Every structure is written in C-alpha cells, then in structure tokens.
Amino acid sequence: HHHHHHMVHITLDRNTANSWLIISKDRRQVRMGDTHQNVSDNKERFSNYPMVLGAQRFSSGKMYWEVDVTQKEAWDLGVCRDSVQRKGQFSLSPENGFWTIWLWQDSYEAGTSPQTTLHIQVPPCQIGIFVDYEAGVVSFYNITDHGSLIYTFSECVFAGPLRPFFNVGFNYSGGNAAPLKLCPL
Numbered sequence: 001h002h003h004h005h006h007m008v009h010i011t012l013d014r015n016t017a018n019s020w021l022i023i024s025k026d027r028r029q030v031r032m033g034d035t036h037q038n039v040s041d042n043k044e045r046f047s048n049y050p051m052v053l054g055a056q057r058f059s060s061g062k063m064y065w066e067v068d069v070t071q072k073e074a075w076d077l078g079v080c081r082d083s084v085q086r087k088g089q090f091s092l093s094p095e096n097g098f099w100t101i102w103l104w105q106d107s108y109e110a111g112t113s114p115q116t117t118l119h120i121q122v123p124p125c126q127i128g129i130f131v132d133y134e135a136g137v138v139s140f141y142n143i144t145d146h147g148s149l150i151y152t153f154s155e156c157v158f159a160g161p162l163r164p165f166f167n168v169g170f171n172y173s174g175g176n177a178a179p180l181k182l183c184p185l
C-alpha cells in the first residue's frame with residue numbers, strides 16, 4: 001500500500017479508558033493493570049471491557065496510523081463512531097458503530113456480524129489502519145508482512161465522527177499483559 005503519507009499522530013484519551021487501564025505519560029501506549037487504577041467513574045469510560053478511544057475525531061479525509069501488538073494473545077483494533085455505547089455488554093459490529101479486527105484464541109477475525117475469518121500467514125507484530133471517510137473504507141494492513149492487506153470494510157455507513165478504537169484484551173491467561181503501542185511516523 002501507499003497510504004503512509006496520510007499518517008496522523010494518534011494519542012489516547014484517558015477519560016474514555018476502562019478504569020483498569022494504564023496509559024503512558026506520552027498517551028501513546030496502553031496496557032491492562034492488575035487492579036482498578038484509582039480514577040473516578042464517568043459516562044465516557046468503557047465499563048465491561050479493557051477499551052479506550054483515541055482523542056482525535058475524524059469527519060473527512062484520509063487517515064493512517066500503526067499499532068504495535070507484539071506478544072499479545074488477544075486485542076481488538078480499528079475505528080468507531082464517537083457515539084458508541086460505553087456501558088454494559090455489546091458486540092463489535094458496523095450496526096453498533098465499530099469497524100474492527102481482532103486476535104482471539106490463535107485466530108484473526110473481522111468484526112462483521114457475524115464475524116469473518118481472516119487469512120494471515122505471517123502473524124503481525126504491527127497493524128496499519130487506513131480510513132477514507134468520503135469513500136466509506138476502513139482497511140487493515142500487516143506491517144510485518146511488507147504491508148499486505150488483511151481486510152477492507154467498504155460501503156461503510158459511519159453516520160458520525162470517527163475515533164480510533166483499542167481493546168488491550170483481558171489477561172486471564174497471564175500471557176496477555178503486553179501493551180498496545182502507537183508506532184512512530
């Protein structure tokens with residue numbers, strides 16, 4: 001792909017984080033803490049899952065960023081509407097305002113309803129995410145495999161401003177403590 005020149009500097013929005021997340025000082029890394037991180041509750045925080053949003057809002061144009069997923073067993077990545085549900089249980093789907101892929105139990109899947117199996121020969125250590133607002137496209141790229149395409153959502157109906165979306169996943173296994181990191185431009 002040749003989307004690198006639409007690179008944007010993403011930072012994480014602390015106020016949206018699940019209360020167990022630890023966001024670095026530079027707001028570029030997030031990991032699961034082993035306990036509640038001693039923050040007050042608010043209506044923005046994802047309550048049920050280890051999720052956080054980027055601070056940036058996109059309503060036009062082409063945007064690209066990269067995320068490091070090295071040594072994680074589980075995570076979700078993509079974009080979502082600014083107005084997605086924060087509280088309670090929900091599925092990651094375009095009907096609910098999410099355009100995402102994930103790793104879970106040694107398989108990669110796109111967050112369609114129902115989910116779609118992905119075909120990845122080289123397990124990615126960094127994921128590239130491209131959004132074309134006007135075209136209604138969200139694409140995912142395997143940076144470890146020379147930028148090969150993972151998945152394209154097309155005919156997207158965003159229906160609002162978009163935010164970068166992250167889920168560090170649970171760490172029930174003791175094998176998923178590693179952070180998500182926003183990679184430098």
Ligand SMILES: Cc1nn(C)c2c(O)nncc12
Binds near residue numbers: 018020047048049050
């Ligand atoms: C194990 C566990 N319980 N709760 C309430 C959690 C939370 O809010 N965020 N991450 C992990 C959690």
